[PDB]
Design an enzyme around this catalytic site. Structure first.
Site, PDB file in Angstrom:
ATOM      1  N   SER A 162      -3.885  -3.672  -8.871  1.00 30.88           N
ATOM      2  CA  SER A 162      -3.875  -5.117  -9.002  1.00 30.88           C
ATOM      3  C   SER A 162      -3.849  -5.651  -7.575  1.00 30.88           C
ATOM      4  O   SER A 162      -2.883  -5.414  -6.840  1.00 30.88           O
ATOM      5  CB  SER A 162      -2.664  -5.593  -9.803  1.00 30.88           C
ATOM      6  OG  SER A 162      -2.648  -7.002  -9.875  1.00 30.88           O
ATOM      7  N   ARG A 163      -4.924  -6.328  -7.173  1.00 31.67           N
ATOM      8  CA  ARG A 163      -5.022  -6.849  -5.814  1.00 31.67           C
ATOM      9  C   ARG A 163      -4.036  -7.978  -5.581  1.00 31.67           C
ATOM     10  O   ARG A 163      -3.582  -8.175  -4.456  1.00 31.67           O
ATOM     11  CB  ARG A 163      -6.458  -7.227  -5.438  1.00 31.67           C
ATOM     12  CG  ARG A 163      -7.234  -6.029  -4.874  1.00 31.67           C
ATOM     13  CD  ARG A 163      -8.709  -6.298  -4.546  1.00 31.67           C
ATOM     14  NE  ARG A 163      -9.465  -5.037  -4.385  1.00 31.67           N
ATOM     15  CZ  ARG A 163     -10.138  -4.397  -5.358  1.00 31.67           C
ATOM     16  NH1 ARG A 163     -10.178  -4.884  -6.603  1.00 31.67           N
ATOM     17  NH2 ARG A 163     -10.788  -3.259  -5.090  1.00 31.67           N
TER      18      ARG A 163
END
Lengths: 268, 255, 239, 122, 55, 118, 118, 127, 126
Positions: free
Chosen positions: B119-120
């Site tokens: 998850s950026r």
């Protein structure tokens, strides 16, 4: 030629390169372990052989028993092959010896050349560091099924780990019950004539000095596997770089060609 | 979904799947005789998907704080994530959850590949309570990957790495989940807490599941105040932590 | 590019132009080219990949009036450095800066990779024999450090040859010394940032590469500017 | 007196100068004097006490051999040797005693009894 | 122990006792390696001969 | 390349050369990665022989004199067969490999082998 | 293959049969590089079980008899589940390699194992 | 003149770089081809060139003569670049008669070859 | 008469390469592996065939029975060539009964195979 074929060839190479670059490190995990059992081994040599040194124990000249030590596990440079050399070299000066092979790679190295000689063979060996329990039982079976204590000469063959970078196939004698008595300076010792000290000390020594060879041969092998996998995973790495160029070209010409094929399909 | 986003409300949209939409788009284009590109997709197949996925957004205060969150889906062929469309979308989204058939058959479900998933946004949108106990778990599972395939043939085990396999196998087993059985965060943190802090290393692997079970309902009956506080604050106090340590060990010993 | 250009032609500055990401400039060119109906070229890129790049990158240069220096985020398709996109782009590159989660995971900020990052201008005729020599030696020292890590991890620090334990100890210093606090980052970090001037950088590292500060603790070199701030920091470490 | 106490795995004393060593030779407890006569004796299982003046460390011992060298050295070679400080919290001796000796395999199960009922004599 | 075993076996039999009655607390990784073996043996003539028994 | 155009004797030689060269090819990668040390003794021999064979097929060309630095040879068909038959029969295993490099027929190998002696 | 649809016992058997067989496929790069000897004592067991399992999935079809000679066997669903569960629970670890191959239900497996004595 | 002193250097280097590939060990340090391993590293060093240092053809053959024939197998690898400038200055002042004869003849007579030979061992004795 | 002697000859040659790749990482050879490797090396060899040289079915049938049933295993791999030409010349004189029976009835009886069992053993010591 085909992206599929190049994709598979690049994977099996990089996979080989994990296998070998890990065996390279599983070796170094085991590298410190190898020096514990190595000096401890050479240490009892100084302790247990000093008796024989002092008794001037030598071979009665009055049919040999040759015991070769390696392992069941391969992929260790020329551990197996050049011990087989030195054992053959020795088998020229006395062809008629019985061979007992400890480890599966020295078994078949020697089974190729002198298959008549091998008369007992010990398996499931290279896996751990060597132990007295192993030694003593292989010893017990040597006495039992091989009649060791009737031999004019008994020889042990192992690789002596000279450095961390190189090794040296060496050979050592085991003197039997009689041979211990007729040593010149055996009298220097006030051995109680009651128990056959010569019998028990032989049996104890046979087991004890097999373990010393085993501990040493074991150590040298670990270094050979460290070094062989050092080279293997470097070659493999070199292959990977080359093939990564060939993959990338085939990757592209496969995109180009599909596109030309499509673009042509609307030339009309 | 935007009707919601525009009116200070929150919609979640799932596009199942964008692999098949892209094929449908290609179909028009090839048939209209519009100019084709790589794999016969329209030259702008990228923009088909980036135009779409930028419409999911969180909005400024001045505009309602409404949100549209998108969970797009791409099918791959033989796990090849370098394929034309997968890469297109991988590069559009704020992160992947890559699932692996390998892991699937092993029994590890959901089959999230910890290595290729991110998850950026990262922590910024994780429940602090969870980020507190959970943090660096992905990284442990990281080193646990390597070591497990390095203990494959390494039967020589220093108490350091061997103990780390035990933590690995336990955290892996804890993260398995039955379908249609989502958990609340106040149920999730006490479970991860026990895991990461080694409280599970002692319990044999086959009974990790029945542990999740008894532990939750035990906590439900007996240590309910702790759960309520986890849920209403989504943070863990030093007292709230001490209560969690206690209740874990209290249970662990009784089972 | 045009805005930053004005600052060179009219305000006569040395201007910074960031393009993030330049690859996206390429794939858009490729999209427009496709839609117009031009036969696609190798790997589907536009027939005009190179001249498209030119009409942009050429405008980034130093003129009699000033300069425009471009820091360009470069995505590399499929990790394949020979792909037409990066291949074409790289021809216009004078240097690289490689930020790295390998450096990051060591708590070293900014996370530049000292080995990886490369400059077509790290050359005596450009930087001067002074700069170049300290530059190379840092790279040689940090390099032998990297290669020996295998044995540092399983054979302990003990078993390095007499001189190698001195380079690793100095390399560990240099490694920390290469970190810097940033002035911008203050509002998140607190630590006062430092603009270290180049003359100071060379000398500060030249001094270490001669071993004048071998005694100075390792935690000192970490997150300070030039050499004096190490002296300053090391002296707060006793108190 | 100098000493080489060697084990396969561990190496306790190597070359150093213990003043007096006690041993269990077959039907003879030896306390090796600083200048004792050359002997080669088989060490039964038991306590090998090394005395370093006003000191003593006992070791229970697997077995092995002791030899007194013509240079008055003592070479004690054994398989297993541990200081008493952490030798045994188990206590499955009697779990082997009646387990071995009660079985009439026969050759060695009976043989494994002779030692165990003798080992725990301290 | 005559018409039977040997001094070294006769000594290994007692050698297991010391290891297997050292408190589990420190019966170590290497310590158990010493207390069991995987070895097998096969006798030979001319090519193989008789059975491959355990040790 | 048929036995009834070239002779069965001629046919058999080239066939086994090919067999040998295909075996050295079939191992190329095992070697390149792991070296000679990991090969069974048969294989290790057929590799020592094929390595000689491969150099023996290289020949100094009259027109290539400017590149070789060596005088050019023109081996006879009957010469070529007998030579390679001998090498297959093991008669030249002890000889250095480099003695086979860039020569004429079998006699040139020995002729050059001695040049490599002292 | 859902507990709701097939019954919990069914699904539980079917899943472990897949898990078992997924382990054998994961272990193959090991047996290829370090033999059978290197395997965990429990891995060794799981490898021994999977071989039986993978051969117990062999089935002589009726239409296939013109190929196999063997009369076409037809196994019922409840037999299959009960059969693969038994073999999972280690109740047939003594019965030979070939016994499990190319037959019907568990009954037929007993018949194969016995007839390999005379 | 170059062709004459360069004798099988082209063919040599490709042989050396191949030998240095099998030089992976190590625990098998050879005595035989170990001398071509020295020549190699010496000749490798000799051919290295600073950019913008194009030497005259007469300044070339003396250097190559010193490499090929082996008047360099003794000299340290870190001082071959020195040997180069040191040996040019020496010849430029002392044996300028040769450097002018190479430039104008284009060949090497045996009288000029033995003349070079002497001046080579002469400079070797002093470094 | 061919199907009967050539049952599972293709499936066997399939299990032969499987063992040949097991011996690729050369290790010890047991009762099972050293048997099928030596066997399959000789069938592969027996199925070598000169060009422009087809064989009648009464020629193929004995050769395959000779190979499959195991009368070729103790014979040097390099000599199977001469075994083909030699075992056929032998069969044409004595066991001409077998060959013209096999040709005509195209099948094999329990009696015919019994004679083929004999003739092959009858030619084992030269």
């Amino acid at each position: 030629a085909t992206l599929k074929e190049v994709e598979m060839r690049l994977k099996s190479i990089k996979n080989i390169e994990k296998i070998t670059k890990t065996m390279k490190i599983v070796a170094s995990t085991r590298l410190s372990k190898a020096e514990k059992a190595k000096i401890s081994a050479k240490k009892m040599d100084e302790a247990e052989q000093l008796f024989y040194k002092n008794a001037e124990t030598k071979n009665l000249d009055v049919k040999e028993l040759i015991v070769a030590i390696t392992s069941d596990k391969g992929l260790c440079g020329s551990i197996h092959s050049q011990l087989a050399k030195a054992v053959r070299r020795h088998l020229n000066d006395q062809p008629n010896a019985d061979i007992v092979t400890i480890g599966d790679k020295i078994k078949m190295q020697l089974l190729r050349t002198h298959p008549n000689n091998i008369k007992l063979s010990i398996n499931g060996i290279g896996k751990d560091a060597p132990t007295f329990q192993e030694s003593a039982l292989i010893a017990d079976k040597l006495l039992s099924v091989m009649k060791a204590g009737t031999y004019p000469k008994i020889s042990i063959f192992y690789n002596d780990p000279v450095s961390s970078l190189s090794f040296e196939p060496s050979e050592k004698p085991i003197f039997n019950a009689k041979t211990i008595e007729q040593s010149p300076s055996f009298g220097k010792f006030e051995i109680d004539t009651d128990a056959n000290v010569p019998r028990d000390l032989f049996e104890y020594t046979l087991a004890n000095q097999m373990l010393t060879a085993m501990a040493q041969g074991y150590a040298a092998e670990i270094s050979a596997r460290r070094n062989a996998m050092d080279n293997a995973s470097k070659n493999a790495g070199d292959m990977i770089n080359r093939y990564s160029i060939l993959y990338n070209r085939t990757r592209q010409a496969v995109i180009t060609n599909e596109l030309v094929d499509i673009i042509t399909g609307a030339s009309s | 979904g935007e009707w919601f986003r525009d009116n200070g409300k929150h919609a979640l949209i799932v596009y199942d799947d964008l692999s098949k939409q892209a094929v449908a788009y290609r179909q028009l284009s090839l048939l209209l005789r519009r100019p084709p590109g790589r794999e016969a997709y329209p030259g702008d197949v990228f923009y088909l998907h980036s135009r779409l996925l930028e419409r999911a957004a969180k909005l400024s205060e001045k505009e309602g704080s409404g949100s549209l969150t998108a969970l797009p889906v791409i099918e791959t062929q033989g796990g090849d994530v370098s394929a034309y469309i997968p890469t297109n979308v991988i590069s559009i989204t704020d992160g992947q959850i890559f699932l692996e058939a390998e892991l699937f058959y092993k029994g590890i479900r959901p089959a999230i590949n910890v290595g290729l998933s991110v998850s950026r946004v990262g922590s910024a949108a994780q429940v602090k309570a969870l980020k507190q106990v959970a943090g660096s778990l992905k990284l442990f599972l990281a080193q646990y990957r390597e070591v497990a395939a390095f203990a494959q043939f390494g039967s020589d085990l220093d108490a350091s790495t061997k103990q780390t396999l035990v933590r690995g196998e336990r955290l892996t087993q804890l993260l398995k989940q039955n379908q249609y059985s989502p958990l609340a965060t106040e149920e999730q943190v006490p479970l991860i807490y026990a895991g990461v802090n080694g409280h599970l290393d002692g319990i044999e692997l086959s009974r990790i599941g029945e542990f999740e079970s008894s532990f939750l309902s035990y906590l439900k009956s007996n240590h309910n105040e702790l759960l309520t506080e986890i849920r209403e604050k989504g943070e863990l106090s030093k007292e709230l932590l001490a209560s969690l340590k206690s209740a874990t060990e209290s249970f662990v010993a009784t089972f | 590019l045009t805005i930053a250009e004005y600052f060179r032609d009219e305000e006569g500055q040395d201007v910074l132009l960031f393009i993030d990401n330049i690859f996206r400039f390429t794939q858009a060119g490729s999209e427009v080219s496709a839609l117009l109906g031009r036969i696609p070229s190798a790997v589907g890129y536009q027939p005009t990949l190179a001249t498209d790049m030119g009409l942009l990158q050429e405008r980034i240069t130093t003129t009699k009036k000033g300069s425009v220096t471009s820091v360009q985020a470069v995505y590399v398709p499929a990790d394949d450095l020979t792909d037409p996109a990066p291949a074409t782009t790289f021809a216009h590159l004078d240097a690289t800066t490689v930020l790295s989660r390998g450096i990051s995971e060591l708590g070293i900020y900014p996370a530049v990779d000292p080995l990886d990052s490369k400059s077509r201008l790290l050359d005596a005729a450009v930087v001067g024999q002074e700069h170049y020599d300290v530059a190379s030696k840092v790279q040689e020292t940090l390099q032998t450090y990297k290669s020996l890590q295998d044995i540092i991890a399983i054979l302990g620090m003990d078993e390095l040859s007499e001189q190698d334990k001195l380079t690793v100890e100095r390399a560990r210093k240099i490694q920390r010394f290469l970190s810097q606090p940033f002035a911008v980052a203050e509002v998140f970090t607190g630590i006062p940032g430092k603009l270290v001037r180049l003359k100071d950088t060379v000398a500060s590292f030249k001094a270490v590469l001669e071993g004048k500060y071998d005694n100075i603790p390792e935690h000192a070199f970490y997150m300070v500017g030039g050499i004096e701030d190490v002296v300053a920091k090391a002296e707060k470490l006793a108190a | 007196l100098k000493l080489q106490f060697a084990l396969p795995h561990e190496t306790l004393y190597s070359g150093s100068e213990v003043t007096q060593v006690n041993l269990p030779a077959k039907s003879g407890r030896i306390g090796v004097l600083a200048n004792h006569v050359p002997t080669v004796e088989q060490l039964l299982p038991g306590v090998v006490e090394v005395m370093e003046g006003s000191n003593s460390k006992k070791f229970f011992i697997s077995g092995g051999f002791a030899t007194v060298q013509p240079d008055s050295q003592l070479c004690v070679t054994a398989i297993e040797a541990f200081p008493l400080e952490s030798f045994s919290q188990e206590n499955i001796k009697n779990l082997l005693a009646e387990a071995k000796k009660n079985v009439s395999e026969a050759a060695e199960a009976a043989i494994q009894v002779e030692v165990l009922e003798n080992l725990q004599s301290v | 122990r005559k018409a039977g075993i040997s001094y070294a076996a006769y000594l290994n039999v007692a050698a297991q006792a010391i290891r297997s009655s050292l408190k589990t607390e420190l019966q170590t990784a290497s310590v158990l390696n010493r207390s069991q073996t995987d070895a097998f043996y096969t006798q030979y003539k001319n090519a193989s001969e008789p059975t491959p028994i355990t040790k």
